[PDB]
Amino acid sequence: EVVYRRPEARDGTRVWELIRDTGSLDLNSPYCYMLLGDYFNDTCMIAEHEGDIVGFISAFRSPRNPETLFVWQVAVASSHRRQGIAKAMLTGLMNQKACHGVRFIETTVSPSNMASRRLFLGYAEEKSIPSTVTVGYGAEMFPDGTTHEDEPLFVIGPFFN
Amino acid sequence: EVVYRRPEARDGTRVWELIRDTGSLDLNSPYCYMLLGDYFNDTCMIAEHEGDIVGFISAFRSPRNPETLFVWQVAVASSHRRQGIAKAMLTGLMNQKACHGVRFIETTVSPSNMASRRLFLGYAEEKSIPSTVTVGYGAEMFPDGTTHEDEPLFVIGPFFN
Ligand SMILES: NCC[C@H](N)C(=O)O
């Protein structure tokens, strides 16, 4: 009964509202999410239940390295936690029609983000694929006048050779 | 004496600070700008003068249509207006090493954004290339509880056939 689809530009505001409700994430402009649905919809997903958006994932193929999928934001409505929605979304991005397969997933996961860490490391373990965690963007790179955790880099792959 | 370069992830915060100072633009997270410099640096530019970032442009090749360059944000520090910095940045994105040439520029320009409109329409006129303005994202697509102008779609091209 949760249904999955690609976003469209018109979903921008309802996606933004979901991100704003997901305090673990850094909120971008509404326009950013319109853009994601207009231009990056092949590498993003929405989950919907009873009208409402209950999940979103944003991602893109890296312009330099088209076999690398960068996963930007994973959001699941607080009402719909622990139902497999994030894993269904990620599986959706990985089983699709693209020219190039996904050889690597890259993403950053702050230490507090337990659910996201278990999503990615659990996917890697299920598939028997290596995962590496390295310094990504440290807290010290963030603006003065704002508090932020480290964003360590997770690299999942190679999925194939 | 203004110098132009591709951004890097480490420029994220100083770029964010510039956007935040550019009230015509919608401010994204600092993390967004780190990402732009890490993954999209081939289609972004920074202008620097006496240490300070005085200009930035963000853009990407459309994943579906790699000959289309989408120009996302154009920012010029208030101290450095009317010196050709935006035009130098855009020229930079258009004269480079990519696999595919830029057949179309797409961008949105709200009515209040006079400088940006003259940038794009003036570039098109200089090059003798058509420009079209159509409904892009209307004010009505934006969130309740927030005020926003229309974002009409500008399509500049074809630059070649
Ligand atoms: N993976 C999330 C990275 C960042 N904290 C964001 O919200 O964009």
Ligand SMILES: NCC[C@H](N)C(=O)O
């Ligand atoms: N980011 C992963 C967490 C989410 N509750 C889910 O499991 O669907």
Ligand SMILES: NCC[C@H](N)C(=O)O
């Ligand atoms: N061209 C700018 C589009 C939008 N107002 C932004 O700031 O992202």
Ligand SMILES: NCC[C@H](N)C(=O)O
């Ligand atoms: N967005 C264009 C305006 C900027 N002052 C410039 O001309 O450099």
Ligand code: NA
């Ligand atoms: Na924006």
Ligand code: NA
């Ligand atoms: Na869930």
Ligand code: NA
């Ligand atoms: Na899940």
Ligand code: NA
């Ligand atoms: Na972000």
Ligand code: NA
């Ligand atoms: Na200028």
Ligand code: NA
């Ligand atoms: Na200019």
